[PDB]
């Protein structure tokens, strides 16, 4: 009876937790990619400016 709704709620909560954690990981990956692109452009710029 009422246990079926509880099971559905538990599965939905577990999926919500997993998706939220995946959202944090995707945000961190986006930040890392931003930093890597910035770093590549900076390296090209300072090689233009003459340092190895």
């Amino acid at each position: 009876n009422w246990l079926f709704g509880k099971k559905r709620k538990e599965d939905a909560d577990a999926l919500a937790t997993l998706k939220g954690q995946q959202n944090r990981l995707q945000a961190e990956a986006r930040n890392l990619e931003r930093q890597s692109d910035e770093q590549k452009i900076l390296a090209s710029k300072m090689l233009k400016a003459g340092n190895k």
Binding site: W2, L3, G5, K6
Partner: protein
């Protein structure tokens, strides 16, 4: 000086750190056992509407 060397301040720091850690663990253990979700167990699917009208 003999007393200060025996019970050094680092020893007191270690003892107080252990007391703090163990107090935290007792609190977490004794609040894990007191979660109201058990005796509550099944909650209203209507989310307190029936108990609202009963009150």
């Amino acid at each position: 000086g003999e007393k200060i060397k025996t019970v050094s301040p680092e020893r007191t720091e270690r003892v107080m750190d252990s007391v703090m850690e163990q107090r935290d663990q007792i609190e977490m253990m004794t609040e894990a056992l007191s979660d109201p979700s058990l005796s509550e167990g099944i909650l209203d699917f209507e989310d307190d509407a029936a108990i609202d009208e009963q009150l």
